[PDB]
Ligand binder design. Structure first.
Ligand SMILES: NC(=O)C1=CN([C@@H]2O[C@H](COP(=O)(O)OP(=O)(O)OC[C@H]3O[C@@H](n4cnc5c(N)ncnc54)[C@H](OP(=O)(O)O)[C@@H]3O)[C@@H](O)[C@H]2O)C=CC1
Ligand SMILES: NC(=O)C1=CN([C@@H]2O[C@H](COP(=O)(O)OP(=O)(O)OC[C@H]3O[C@@H](n4cnc5c(N)ncnc54)[C@H](OP(=O)(O)O)[C@@H]3O)[C@@H](O)[C@H]2O)C=CC1
Ligand SMILES: CN(Cc1cnc2nc(N)nc(N)c2n1)c1ccc(C(=O)N[C@@H](CCC(=O)O)C(=O)O)cc1
Ligand SMILES: CN(Cc1cnc2nc(N)nc(N)c2n1)c1ccc(C(=O)N[C@@H](CCC(=O)O)C(=O)O)cc1
Ligand SMILES: Nc1nc2[nH]cc(Cc3ccc(C(=O)Nc4ccccc4CC(=O)O)cc3)c2c(=O)[nH]1
Ligand SMILES: Nc1nc2[nH]cc(Cc3ccc(C(=O)Nc4ccccc4CC(=O)O)cc3)c2c(=O)[nH]1
Ligand SMILES: O=c1[nH]c(=O)n([C@H]2C[C@H](O)[C@@H](COP(=O)(O)O)O2)cc1F
Ligand SMILES: O=c1[nH]c(=O)n([C@H]2C[C@H](O)[C@@H](COP(=O)(O)O)O2)cc1F
Lengths: 506, 506
């Protein structure tokens, strides 16, 4: 009685694994994973057995794999005894004689085809599943991986990797069937109520924890957002704010995101990527005219730029969509005397974005690559004070550009998915203009909250197991950061769950 | 064969437990901990046995404890059979007959005196130790807790609690004697080198991990700093900077600190608390004269305020210790045209600190309580750009004041211990002026680094097991935040390790 594991690489949605007798992709790192996961043994005097169908045996050229014994399932192949590294059995059941005897076999792996996968789960022989989800779907398949039965639960999900612009994950599904420290902490939690800081930061309950079975393997960095969503539902204090819609708020959180091998665009909800870019390039160009976004069918700044909202906050004399000095006016013309959105401010103010780019490539190891937007002198003229307040940038020793963002207030339903993608794109743009590669993205949050009208929606989003991040590449290299266009951005491998509607609190 | 645990409350340094037949302190929460830790049982049809000496039996008034069987060790007391909850044995060895028979006893606890504690460890009967370290030392003891033998290792250290201005911890010492997820992550770490983000954030090795035996119980919030020290020693990239002393730097870190029941002043190194305050009140008053700190014997701003350093950065015309517009000039006179340190700036600039206090008590649930110091227009006039750049404050539903601080650059040897205490004191001052209690302190760090001349010192600091945080209380309630004086601050229960000398990089 030893371990039997399935190793497979299937597509993310349709679970396709083959086409015309070969794989529908060429991922080098995946083959290395298969080689290391099937050679992983504890006894040096034992070998691992790899069960596979005949057509798969034809796919690998009918040649043995080093340090392993290939078990071919076929009714026609002659049970040859010449090659000691290849053995043939007539049916799958007989091949599981590796259990009963043959103590020289330590582990068993089932890396066959649809025919072998299907009647290996149906016959209930599989203990573990090593799944390699690949983000390719608009191609043709003819051989699929069967649906994972409900007896299996995911226990690990790696970060999203990239090979030839193809995103892929690594998951582990397992078949389901000290206390002295935990008890002492519980007893101290009963004595001190909210005096013990642990009780102010309780672990989320299972009913609000996305994919609860993955306990120790929450490596995928979308969990940095889905678990922040859970921490708010658990510890969020019911509070009122400037709007009529109350929130559940906690203070002091952070999220990390990789940008080297993936793009932190959430997959549990279809995020409008075009509107994010059109807002970011709107900041970079220095524009404050709210109509230029409406002319491009971007209505995210319409609520805070209406005639009734401006008169309500004391800016009735201001024009319709004149948001005033905001993001992109403190970036390009800091401390500049703002008049209207039609005047020409070329030359006035401190150009932080220009000095940022000039410093990033003339002094990379400088510790002052900071782009701020909090101007106390201009706060009263703003239609809305800056939420993503201050950002710092960092050049690593391997010529990568990381980014840290502090956010005073975070709408986890609407603003947060945008802010993650927006500052990811901005870091990539700065990397190309300065000649670096994208690094990491860390977002530090002050007032992390959830609007009470988003409770039914965000609980729906938490019920969706995350999919691998897509890839974002630029089609051309620009000479100045202002020259970026929407046609220059190519989003590769984005297969999200259906979009979720959530109303903005004005 | 069941479990035998020691329960004891000893002083932090000398390990005193008694005086004149009674305890040297009155901590209510500690007695509740003893009651719950000795009643913790799994079988409802069994009771726990509490072994204690005769003099301890006199201390509790010779009356039984509910739901427990007290075992008194005494050579003179008559072995009475009347009370079934009290039994007397002639020696400690005979009393450990609870093991051999009497299956109605589930657990055994040794909460005796020095006489019972000493020959319970010497006879090697103890499996676990529940230690309650109390921060009282300048009093008189006559009964001590014996030194913990090397066979025990700490596995848990709770946060610092407060009762009647007395700080105390809870530790657990234990006697020393799935893999499928860990292996898959290791295999992916071999395939992808630094492409897997986990390899850029490696767990610190044991030789640089403070108190490595405490794996799952790093509750004490001094570990938020000692483990950041370890993460830098593990992943820190060797980089040069504006000074001649290179650093080991990582990007994007955070630390949490409780301020309700303790004061985050590091105990692994004696921190000059007076110099921290004199710098903070120097900021609050709006002063930029570097000599006023030297007149108060505070020389932390002498390196960056010398005649040779000012001429080196292009400010030769500036006076000797005229640091220019820095912290405390952007706080009180933001965007104010700076001349010299002798002029009168009363009225010019935006007073953030005043508007911060006015907003904290007139609109607590506001999400804009932000105090910034990054002014791009005044950066060129500064002797040193702001390190603690921007801070945000938050009022909880139970009238507590939390604080978030973003720090672009962090000298983990010198600036970090100061910044932790400085913004802790500032939050407490704002709480008293606004009528709140201290809450939490979260510090978000950009360039967290360690200067290479601090390597021998910081490794020494990592070899010291942390002690409970002290308490900081104000002697009087001030009417304005500027009225605070050093005589008004009382530091209670600070018993740190000896101070460590580290040179500042100018
Ligand atoms: N992405 C991935 O991880 C993997 C993908 N693949 C791909 O899948 C494709 C091949 O898989 P597939 O087409 O399903 O063929 P299979 O690999 O599953 O093998 C099929 C053969 O196995 C034998 N067989 C199957 N069931 C039985 C049975 N109940 N009793 C006796 N013999 C049986 C038959 O051999 P016979 O007719 O001779 O008796 C049959 O022709 C290829 O494109 C391959 O590249 C393969 C492995 C892994
Ligand atoms: N901080 C804490 O957690 C605790 C503190 N304390 C404090 O400690 C003080 C008391 O402890 P302490 O003074 O050490 O006295 P003890 O509680 O250790 O008990 C002493 C008595 O135990 C008996 N005894 C001890 N050793 C032996 C032996 N080898 N054989 C037979 N009998 C033995 C003797 O009784 P006899 O002479 O009658 O034979 C002796 O007088 C008190 O102040 C108490 O409050 C007590 C418990 C816990
Ligand atoms: C056609 N086929 C089946 C195949 C392909 N990809 C997979 N990918 C995954 N994740 N899981 C599988 N079971 C799997 N199976 C193949 C193809 C090549 C090799 C192979 O050459 N393996 C070498 C590895 C070669 C290398 O290191 O790049 C080995 O050492 O096992 C194995 C199976
Ligand atoms: C003198 N003495 C010994 C004593 C005192 N403090 C300690 N504190 C600690 N952490 N550990 C000990 N072993 C300990 N022992 C005492 C004093 C009072 C009670 C006592 O009354 N215990 C009640 C608790 C009373 C309450 O809940 O406040 C119980 O239910 O056990 C026990 C032992
Ligand atoms: N309270 C408050 N005020 C704000 N002022 C400005 C903002 C930024 C902001 C960011 C995002 C959206 C938004 O509608 N997103 C969204 C989400 C899911 C599906 C479709 C869309 C719309 C689309 O297809 O673009 C709106 C506003 C903002 C905020 O998020 N909250
Ligand atoms: N590179 C660089 N530039 C700086 N400019 C300004 C600072 C702030 C700062 C903070 C602390 C100290 C300092 O000497 N601490 C210390 C530590 C241990 C023992 C004794 C003392 C001195 C004492 O008793 O006060 C000096 C400077 C600072 C910095 O920390 N690093
Ligand atoms: O980029 C943004 N990100 C964001 O999260 N918000 C949300 C956060 C909050 O719900 C509201 C502003 O909070 P407040 O108006 O109280 O400062 O806008 C707005 C943005 F523009
Ligand atoms: O409050 C402070 N905290 C701090 O950590 N430093 C250190 C960090 C770094 O070692 C140096 C400034 O880094 P740089 O001069 O490169 O901006 O001062 C200075 C302060 F004033």
């Amino acid at each position: 009685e030893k371990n039997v594991s399935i190793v497979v690489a299937a597509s993310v949605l349709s679970s396709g694994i083959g086409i015309n007798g070969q794989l529908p992709w060429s991922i080098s790192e995946d083959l290395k994973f298969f080689s290391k996961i099937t050679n992983n043994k504890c006894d040096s005097n034992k070998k691992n057995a790899l069960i596979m169908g005949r057509k798969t045996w034809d796919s690998i050229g009918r040649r043995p794999l080093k340090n392993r014994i290939i078990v071919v399932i076929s009714s026609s192949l002659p049970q040859d005894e010449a090659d000691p590294n290849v053995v043939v059995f007539r049916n799958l059941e007989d091949s599981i004689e590796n259990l009963m005897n043959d103590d020289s076999i330590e582990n068993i792996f089932v890396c066959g085809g649809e025919s072998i996968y299907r009647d290996a789960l149906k016959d209930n022989f599989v203990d573990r599943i090593y799944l390699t989800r690949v983000a390719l779907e608009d191609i043709e398949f003819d051989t699929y991986f069967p649906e994972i039965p409900e007896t299996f639960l995911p226990v690990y999900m790696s970060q999203t990797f990239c090979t030839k612009n193809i995103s892929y994950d690594f998951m582990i599904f397992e078949k389901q069937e000290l206390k002295s420290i935990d008890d002492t902490v519980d007893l101290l939690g009963e004595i001190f109520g909210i005096r013990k800081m642990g009780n102010r930061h309780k672990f989320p309950k299972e009913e609000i924890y996305n994919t609860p079975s993955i306990r120790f393997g929450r490596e995928h960095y979308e969990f940095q957002y889905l678990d922040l969503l859970s921490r708010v539902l658990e510890n969020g204090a019911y509070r009122e704010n400037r709007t009529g819609i109350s929130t559940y708020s906690i203070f002091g959180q952070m999220m990390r995101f990789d940008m080297r091998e993936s793009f932190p665009l959430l997959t549990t909800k279809k995020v409008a990527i075009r509107s994010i870019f059109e807002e970011l390039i709107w900041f970079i160009k220095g524009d404050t005219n709210g109509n230029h976004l409406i002319e491009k069918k971007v209505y995210i700044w319409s609520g805070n730029g209406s005639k009734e909202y401006l008169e309500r906050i004391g800016l009735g004399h201001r024009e319709e969509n004149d948001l005033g000095p905001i993001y992109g006016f403190q970036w390009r013309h800091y401390n500049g005397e703002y008049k209207t959105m039609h005047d020409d401010y070329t030359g006035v103010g401190v150009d932080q974005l220009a000095k940022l780019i000039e410093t990033l490539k003339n002094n990379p190891k400088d510790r002052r690559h900071i782009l701020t937007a909090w101007n106390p002198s201009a706060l009263s003229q703003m239609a809305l004070p800056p939420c993503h307040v201050l950002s710092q940038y960092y050049v690593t020793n391997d010529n990568c550009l990381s980014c840290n963002l502090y956010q005073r207030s975070c709408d986890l339903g609407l603003g947060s998915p945008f802010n993650i993608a927006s500052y990811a794109i901005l870091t990539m743009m700065l990397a190309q203009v300065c000649g670096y590669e994208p690094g990491e993205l860390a977002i530090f949050i002050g007032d992390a909250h959830i609007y009470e009208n988003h409770l039914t929606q965000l609980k729906e989003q938490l019920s969706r197991t995350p999919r691998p991040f897509p890839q974002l590449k630029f089609k051309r290299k620009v000479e100045n950061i202002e020259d970026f266009k929407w046609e220059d951005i190519e989003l590769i491998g984005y297969y999200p769950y259906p979009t979720i509607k959530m109303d903005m609190a004005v």
